[PDB]
């Protein structure tokens, strides 16, 4: 039921949060470790594609558990505009 899924989302962050709070920023320039509310992201290497685990709060998790959300990091080290959501979602 919706209530349960929602509570689970509420957990997936406040987890991403404390990791991010535990995590100390890289030496060189990198995209901020941050919570976009959908997936949780690592600090990203400069000018690289960041890989994220398929979120667990997401139903149909286990199908996609191994999968990744690919999101590119800027030249600057600014987080890019768009996300690549697949391996994390394919219920069919």
């Amino acid at each position: 039921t919706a209530g349960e899924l929602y509570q689970r989302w509420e957990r997936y962050r406040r987890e991403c949060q404390e990791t991010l709070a535990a995590a100390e920023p890289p030496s060189g320039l990198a995209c901020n470790g941050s919570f976009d509310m959908y997936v949780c992201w690592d600090y990203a290497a400069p000018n690289a594609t960041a890989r994220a685990s398929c979120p667990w709060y997401l139903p149909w998790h286990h199908h996609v558990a191994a999968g990744f959300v690919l999101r590119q990091c800027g030249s600057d080290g600014q987080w890019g505009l768009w996300r690549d959501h697949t391996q994390c979602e394919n219920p069919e």
Partner: antibody, heavy 117, light 111 residues
């Protein structure tokens, strides 16, 4: 970030189906929620659905009035309201989000539905 | 059918703190985290604070969320002109299904 259907004028006791048209890709993954606002008043939640997953969610008091569904291809999620009313005269926004109960950072322009005889 | 935002309106002076309280019952705010939306005249709602005082991209630390034990609170701690708007707090409800909003609060700056 979603283009909605555009304004509608309808007589009471009738039915209107307004569309929320999303990104050609990146659609099925997130919850789509519909919120309405009567001119001059506050927000009212209606329901939400993860387009490609399970059944739509609703709030009580719309009972047998609102049907929220979604289409695979057109990557659009429509919603239908029956037994129309003056209290249904409003503007209808579709906000994208992570899950159904969760908050929404992405809204639409909204589609105004005016209802009078 | 409403968690009451306490306030139909609330006033404020530029460079001062303005607080908007939102009361509830224990199936809504008591049992979950409160959100906050900012709507501007002629505009759609805009996410201000989600999940008990966390914030989305590009939202200054000016805004802050409160406990949710009985009623929550939004605090805009240094006011501006572009801060006059409708403010709708929101929470999920355990007792009766989906999310519920507040009556909203139009905030005022002084000319």
């Amino acid at each position: 970030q979603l283009q909605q259907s555009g304004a509608e004028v309808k007589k009471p006791g009738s039915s209107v189906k307004v569309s929320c048209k999303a990104s050609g890709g990146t659609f099925s993954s997130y919850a789509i929620s519909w919120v309405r606002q009567a001119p001059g008043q506050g927000l009212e939640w209606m329901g939400g659905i993860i387009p490609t997953f399970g059944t739509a969610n609703y709030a009580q008091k719309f009972q047998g009035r609102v049907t929220i569904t979604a289409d695979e291809s057109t990557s659009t999620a429509y919603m239908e309201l029956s037994s129309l009313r003056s209290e249904d005269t409003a503007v209808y926004y579709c906000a994208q989000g992570p899950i159904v109960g969760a908050p929404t950072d992405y809204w639409g322009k909204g589609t105004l539905v005016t209802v009078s005889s | 059918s409403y968690v009451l935002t306490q306030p139909p309106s609330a006033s404020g002076t530029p460079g001062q703190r303005v607080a908007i309280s939102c009361s509830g019952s224990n199936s809504n705010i008591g049992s979950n985290t409160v959100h906050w939306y900012q709507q501007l005249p002629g505009a759609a709602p805009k996410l201000l604070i989600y999940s008990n005082n966390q914030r989305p991209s590009g939202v200054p630390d000016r805004f802050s969320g409160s406990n949710s034990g009985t009623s929550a609170s939004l605090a805009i701690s240094r006011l501006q002109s572009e801060d006059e708007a409708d403010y709708y707090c929101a929470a999920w409800d355990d007792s009766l299904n989906g999310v519920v909003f507040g009556g909203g609060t139009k905030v005022t700056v002084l000319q």
